[PDB]
Amino acid sequence: RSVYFCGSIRGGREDQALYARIVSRLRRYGKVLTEHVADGDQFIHEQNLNWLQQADVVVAEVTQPSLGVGYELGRAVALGKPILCLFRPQSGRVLSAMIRGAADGSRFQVWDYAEGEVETMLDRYFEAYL
Amino acid sequence: RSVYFCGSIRGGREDQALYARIVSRLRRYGKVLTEHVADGGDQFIHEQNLNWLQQADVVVAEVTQPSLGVGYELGRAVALGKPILCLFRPQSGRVLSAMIRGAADGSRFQVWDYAEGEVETMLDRYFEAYLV
Numbered sequence: 141r142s143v144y145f146c147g148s149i150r151g152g153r154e155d156q157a158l159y160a161r162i163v164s165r166l167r168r169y170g171k172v173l174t175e176h177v178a179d180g181d182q183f184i185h186e187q188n189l190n191w192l193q194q195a196d197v198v199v200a201e202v203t204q205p206s207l208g209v210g211y212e213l214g215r216a217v218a219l220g221k222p223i224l225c226l227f228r229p230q231s232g233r234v235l236s237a238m239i240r241g242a243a244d245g246s247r248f249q250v251w252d253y254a255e256g257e258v259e260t261m262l263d264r265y266f267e268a269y270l
Numbered sequence: 271r272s273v274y275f276c277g278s279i280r281g282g283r284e285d286q287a288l289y290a291r292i293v294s295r296l297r298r299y300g301k302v303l304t305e306h307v308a309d310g311g312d313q314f315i316h317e318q319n320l321n322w323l324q325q326a327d328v329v330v331a332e333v334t335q336p337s338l339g340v341g342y343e344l345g346r347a348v349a350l351g352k353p354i355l356c357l358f359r360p361q362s363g364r365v366l367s368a369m370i371r372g373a374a375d376g377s378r379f380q381v382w383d384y385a386e387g388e389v390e391t392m393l394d395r396y397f398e399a400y401l402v
């Protein structure tokens with residue numbers, strides 16, 4: 141019922157519009173805790189960690205390399221959160237071996253998708269596992 | 271005694287020469303588990319690195335170039351309780367991730383801004399006086 145969404149901010153805002161589409165679709169399946177990703181660092185880290193601790197599921201869009209997104213994934217793994225990572229191969233980038241290599245059973249999943257299918261992919265995951 | 275160094279790879283290799291200098295200087299204070307950063311499959315890479323991280327006495331990360339892997343390593347290392355030094359170079363023109371700078375917490379997670387010419391003496395100082 142509570143969803144933590146990860147997406148690049150200071151790693152770059154190229155995929156901002158897509159993050160907005162992702163958040164909007166995630167709302168059907170839960171309370172999105174991290175709305176800001178779509179739209180004082182001490183405060184932000186604490187606020188977000190509190191949100192992460194209370195989240196039922198963690199969704200990250202991992203196309204744009206980001207320290208913060210990586211960090212949220214690492215903390216989430218260590219909190220035993222179920223994780224879905226969405227990556228876009230058409231971008232031409234190669235996903236971090238630490239994110240792709242983190243894939244493990246149902247608990248940590250990395251999904252490759254084409255941009256126009258992001259909502260359908262989210263529907264697929266939540267129907268199947270949530 | 272053993273040190274785990276994090277540096278961007280697939281996030282980009284812009285700062286590779288700085289990674290080489292850091293690894294070089296870290297070899298004065300312990301064995302570096304992750305020297306390859308300064309130069310199987312993703313599953314193997316992840317497991318190998320995670321095993322090294324779990325046994326590391328200290329984690330050092332250069333955090334100027336944004337990187338999923340580096341972030342991930344810092345997240346896993348925080349949960350494990352490993353002492354962390356992050357090195358950020360502001361002359362890059364970048365603003366460091368709020369989740370990295372905000373993670374700073376006493377002796378267990380430090381975030382140091384550095385000028386590129388002083389990076390070695392910064393590492394000397396950390397191991398001399400800022401490492402519990």
Ligand SMILES: CC(C)CCNc1ncnc2c1ncn2[C@@H]1O[C@H](COP(=O)(O)O)[C@@H](O)[C@H]1O
Pocket residue numbers: 145146147148149150151152174176177184188205206207208209212366367368369
């Ligand atoms: C008061 C604000 C909304 C300030 C703006 N700053 C932020 N606010 C909320 N979450 C953030 C902020 N910066 C980074 N994050 C989190 O860290 C991730 C982005 O990391 P990055 O900035 O290193 O690329 C996102 O998934 C966010 O959840």
Ligand SMILES: CC(C)CCNc1ncnc2c1ncn2[C@@H]1O[C@H](COP(=O)(O)O)[C@@H](O)[C@H]1O
Pocket residue numbers: 235236237238275276277278279280281282304306307315319337338339340343
């Ligand atoms: C064909 C390649 C580019 C292979 C690189 N494969 C790798 N080998 C060893 N460690 C890695 C590798 N990729 C990521 N890492 C680790 O994760 C961090 C870099 O992640 P990044 O690729 O998301 O920037 C570094 O601190 C490394 O310790």
